């Protein structure tokens, strides 16, 4: 009845559709049985992980070893998703994204391999996506004009005017422009290139913008014919679906059409250096920093063995975690608390993506005069670790942390396994040996108990006696990007001058045909698709029981197969808090569990947290009510995790944090605030559309204003202001004031997710913890421009609509997904040139339009206006509504892990009755209701708009009196 029981029936030497069973291993700590097959005729390798998890995942892996910095596997990865032989239609990937019930569908290109994974829960959907993926990777139409669109091409500044000069355009070209505006990517790339300068790791695999136009269409076709051959492929599947169906599809669709080749693609070993080296590089000065003399980053890197010998890599990874993770690590005490820098260097710790892994440590944010100081600190610190070793409590904490990651149940487990074995498997390693974590832990414990200086000899061998050291420093130059502009313009002129007028007319005519390709709406009916009849009408009910305890705290217990894990959550309201202290509540949540409690200093507190729990965190949440736009819930979520046996210790930790938090530890507090502020400044681009949509919605609902206070740009500006204060004491006095309003049991509710066998002891520990603790808005329009020194823009427009329980809400959600799939995607992405762009509908009722990395600004809002006119126009078919329903049900029915089932009832108070009502409204939504809601809410002048833009200077915006610039 189970998956691993039938999977254990595969005997060695069995022939199944051209494959041969080579190895079957039971992995009891992961509740799975691994099966390794190879195709006899082609030599393709297959690893199947059978586990009773309904979220089945497929992935295929190709070894791509580039020998130049042209970016050929990255552009080829983009090009294979544009069309294949059996499905000649345009863009099969994104079209199947709206014709499937997938939960994830993407592709990855690492430094030396490319990986194409997908996951879904429906077996027919699995067969459909498997056919589209096999066909996309192995038989693409590799049309040259698609290569001109996705890769690089010459194009006029106005594509219709052949007398303006030609400039470079391309998707990957601007991807690499954005790769080398990032200082961290320059540092990481140059570090990897300098440490392994012999072979494929010495080049920029993503593409050097000055070396990208050397790639021709014929070179791309040869690269595809050489590397995307099934003899150079690794196939991987995970889940409970029958293996035989997969093998029948793989054989009958792809592998039968090829014959055996011998890939000459093995990456040779790096020859060890005789002497350490130093290199100096330069980057672009960051504008978020305020001091220019404190912008130097320095690192020291060590070469470690190969990933093939699994054991030694596991050992050195544990050693690297012991050396750099947490305030009890030697390097934290030596570097962070020295006050020389601001944070660790990039790629800090163990980096096992290359063939030979490497260790890195260093600082960023130092003054250039302190480079030799840092190098001496690292040398002296290594000497102290050699002489003193590690204490046993930290080793136990590390082994307990790895045990927790082994037992924890995620929703994307198969994705974690394929990413965790891809690197070892890529270099002819045994992927099954990485799965047996219990065996390696046992051997590690034995190796420590037999030799007390085991870790001391390992740090000695790989740090004190390893001559393969790389010291690399990076300091910015104020004129770097003008040099960059000069060299790209020089290659531009060098390539444009050699073109004849007939060549230029060929470029112009291809440009007009390309623009038509980007404009003409095409048919995608040759792709397979699911119907609404395959969507389940009702969901299985989730069982809860609320027990009032001690003497009025509601506690929600949900029996779940969590595999010996207990997840405890508590949510405390903020309704009694004075309004002056609201903006410092994220800071309060971010430092509360890191400063010490009772008789424990911050080092001992961090040791206890890492030794007993899986992590304890606090974060502010604003939970809107579902039936009133002007009603909301504000609060703080305390969340923790522990193994079954360490539960009373965890609740004792929570009691000590609730009754005696250490608000007097000032030195470590200054470190934490400067680190949090630096992290917030580094994360602006990846969440730029999030910050823009949150700013645009501040003036529409009270909940929006509070969400801007807790997590908007206000929080970043506040964190920077606090991080620039020289005297931190007036900020530190605010923390007891918040503590006396939050850490009590007056307005509290709790949740527990655990196995039913553990439940009475858990009920006792929580009931023991609860006894141990103390006892009309009118929206108005606003336009905001953050003048940011960015090369791309982030635009957000918010529209006020109905809440969740309103019958029009489900129709609005369908309309939002419809507009995203059939208008905004083509216009903003293909035509506009943005990396991401669409429309979303939130639970509170804010209809948000967003753009991500958009080179335009005014045209984006104008395309939003043309999009709402399109939605009112009704120019969409019934099949488009079917695709929108499919995508929405692909989103709302995404799998939930045992640790958050059910979280919606605990946080937002939506019952199963409410979810079923909204599900039947999503079923009953029709074309006329979509027209009705489009003319009632999204139309111009019917509701209040809000706009916000993060991006570079726009002179026309500066002359607009209706805009406020911040």
Author numbering: 31 to 805, 847 to 1037
From the paper:
Presequence protease (PreP), a 117 kDa mitochondrial M16C metalloprotease vital for mitochondrial proteostasis, degrades presequence peptides cleaved off from nuclear-encoded proteins and other aggregation-prone peptides, such as amyloid β (Aβ). Of the Aβ-degrading proteases, PreP belongs to the chamber-containing protease (crypt-containing peptidase, or cryptidase) family that uses a sizable catalytic chamber to engulf, unfold, and degrade their substrates. PreP-N and PreP-C, in the closed state of PreP, form an enclosed catalytic chamber to entrap and degrade monomeric amyloidogenic peptides, thereby preventing the formation of toxic aggregates. Comparison of the five cryoEM structures derived from the apo- and substrate-bound PreP reveals three key conformational states based on the degree of opening of the catalytic chamber: open (O), partially open (either pO1 or pO2), and partially closed (pC).
3D classification of PreP particles revealed three distinct open state structures of PreP. They were refined to an open state (O) and two partially open states (pO1 and pO2) with resolutions of 4, 3.7, 3.9, respectively. Apo-PreP has three states, O, pO1, and pO2 that are distinct from each other with the two pO states being slightly more open than the pC or C states. Of these structures, the pO, pC, and C states of PreP have a small variation in the degree of opening, making their chamber inaccessible to substrate binding. 3D classification revealed that most PreP particles (~74%) were in the partially open (pO) states, indicating that PreP in the absence of substrate prefers to be in a state inaccessible to substrate binding. Consistent with the cryoEM data, the SEC-SAXS data confirms that apo-PreP in solution also prefers to adopt the pO state (72% based on OLIGOMER and 90% based on ensemble optimization modeling (EOM)). The fact that PreP in solution prefers the pO state rather than the open state is logical because the transition from the pO states to O state loses substantial buried surface (650–940 Å2) and a network of hydrogen bonds and salt bridges, and thus is energetically unfavorable. The switch A and C regions in the pO states have lower resolution and higher thermal B factors than the rest of PreP structures. As switch A contains residues involved in substrate peptide binding and catalytic zinc ion coordination, such high dynamics would render the pO state catalytically incompetent. The transition from the pO states to O states allows the capture of the substrate, and thus is a key state in the catalytic cycle.
